[PDB]
Amino acid sequence: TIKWIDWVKQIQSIAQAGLTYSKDVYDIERFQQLRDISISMMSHYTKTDWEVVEKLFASETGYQTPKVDIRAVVFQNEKLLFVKEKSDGKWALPGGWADVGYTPTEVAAKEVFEETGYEVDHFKLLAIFDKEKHQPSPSATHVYKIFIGCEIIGGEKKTSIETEEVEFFGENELPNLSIARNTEDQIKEMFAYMKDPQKEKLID
Amino acid sequence: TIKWIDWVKQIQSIAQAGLTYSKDVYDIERFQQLRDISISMMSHYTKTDWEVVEKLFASETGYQTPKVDIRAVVFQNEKLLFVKEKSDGKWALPGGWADVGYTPTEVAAKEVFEETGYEVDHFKLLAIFDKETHVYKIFIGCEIIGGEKKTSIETEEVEFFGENELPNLSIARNTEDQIKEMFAYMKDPQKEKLID
Numbered sequence: 153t154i155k156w157i158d159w160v161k162q163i164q165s166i167a168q169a170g171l172t173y174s175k176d177v178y179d180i181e182r183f184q185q186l187r188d189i190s191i192s193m194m195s196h197y198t199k200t201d202w203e204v205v206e207k208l209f210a211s212e213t214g215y216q217t218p219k220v221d222i223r224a225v226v227f228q229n230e231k232l233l234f235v236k237e238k239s240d241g242k243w244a245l246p247g248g249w250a251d252v253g254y255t256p257t258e259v260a261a262k263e264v265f266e267e268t269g270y271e272v273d274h275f276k277l278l279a280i281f282d283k284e285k286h287q288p289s290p291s292a293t294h295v296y297k298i299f300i301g302c303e304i305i306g307g308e309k310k311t312s313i314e315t316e317e318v319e320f321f322g323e324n325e326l327p328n329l330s331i332a333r334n335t336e337d338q339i340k341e342m343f344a345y346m347k348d349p350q351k352e353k354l355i356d
Numbered sequence: 357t358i359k360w361i362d363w364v365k366q367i368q369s370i371a372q373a374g375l376t377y378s379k380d381v382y383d384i385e386r387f388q389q390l391r392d393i394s395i396s397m398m399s400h401y402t403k404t405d406w407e408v409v410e411k412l413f414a415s416e417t418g419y420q421t422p423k424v425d426i427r428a429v430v431f432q433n434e435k436l437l438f439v440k441e442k443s444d445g446k447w448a449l450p451g452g453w454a455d456v457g458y459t460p461t462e463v464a465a466k467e468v469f470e471e472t473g474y475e476v477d478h479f480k481l482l483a484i485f486d487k488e489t490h491v492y493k494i495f496i497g498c499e500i501i502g503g504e505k506k507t508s509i510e511t512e513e514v515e516f517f518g519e520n521e522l523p524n525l526s527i528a529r530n531t532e533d534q535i536k537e538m539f540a541y542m543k544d545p546q547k548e549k550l551i552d
């Protein structure tokens with residue numbers, strides 16, 4: 153019901169597109185002004201520093217698309233693999249932002265290895281969720297979350313500075329979820345796939 | 357003070373000047389998009405200020421990821437919907453960059469409607485390609501439920517094409533192997549969905 157956030161996100165996106173593709177020197181200056189207005193609006197109405205907002209909201213290059221998050225979906229004995237971050241104390245599927253220069257499966261494999269110690273392969277395309285569709289909170293950013301099924305083929309469980317705990321959980325014993333990293337409804341869809349792996353793939 | 361009102365009027369005034377003076381069709385489209393949004397903003401919050409959202413950037417880091425391109429995969433009795441591109445006069449599936457504010461399926465529906473005039477539904481996730489600007493290319497299947505064929509200033513031609521009568525492909529928009537894979541899915545339903 154906070155309508156203004158999404159208008160301002162659309163204004164920045166169009167200003168970014170203009171700064172990328174316009175060859176008209178007065179129009180390029182128009183798009184910069186518009187981008188700078190989007191930062192001023194966000195800065196004021198979030199009480200966030202102007203230059204911090206510029207970095208977080210308005211420093212991308214090229215046409216603006218949603219950002220990509222990857223979530224690795226690994227089962228053992230009908231229990232789903234979760235990792236707990238030391239700092240926030242909350243639990244999620246292994247994954248994170250898609251690093252530029254990596255394919256979606258290369259991100260899944262790297263994130264699982266760094267967060268859990270496990271080697272994985274045998275990738276399956278499970279789902280794409282739109283983070284903003286029924287999102288609890290307003291978002292400055294738009295995210296698509298790709299869920300990739302993987303098989304453990306090696307390594308061994310290893311914790312780290314960032315990851316305090318690596319554990320499997322059944323559908324009826326879920327730990328305290330980082331809703332920012334995975335929703336309860338996304339976890340339910342992954343247990344549905346585990347029960348019926350030939351089921352249609354969820355795409356928002 | 358209510359600061360949003362003066363900022364939106366600045367946006368409106370810049371967009372109006374852009375609209376008047378631009379000769380480039382894509383700049384005119386951008387300024388029209390900005391005009392449209394400015395109209396929508398002024399028709400709400402008649403008296404109220406905007407809600408302050410002090411936690412909006414709490415867990416934001418400015419992390420950049422690959423860009424998303426979407427291609428809509430639309431079959432009509434074993435022929436695939438292609439579009440002749442203004443930019444090169446070569447052919448591609450309807451699609452383009454996924455826009456902020458749109459789900460993957462809304463993107464596929466939007467691009468199909470604007471490029472061809474067809475309404476589509478019954479979306480299926482077919483594939484995500486990336487042969488390593490960095491781009492993840494999402495292929496979404498859907499079916500015509502409505503509308504009718506319509507050429508444009510950007511889309512000179514709309515044409516269905518079989519696997520042995522494929523036009524000159526716009527290779528950046530869709531590779532030969534990507535098109536082949538799509539025919540494979542139509543012919544062998546529940547073939548393993550590719551993810552790079």
Ligand SMILES: O=C[C@H](O)[C@H](O)[C@H](O)CO
Pocket residue numbers: 173174215382383452453
């Ligand atoms: O790529 C898609 C963009 O809409 C066009 O390339 C821009 O309008 C720039 O001309």
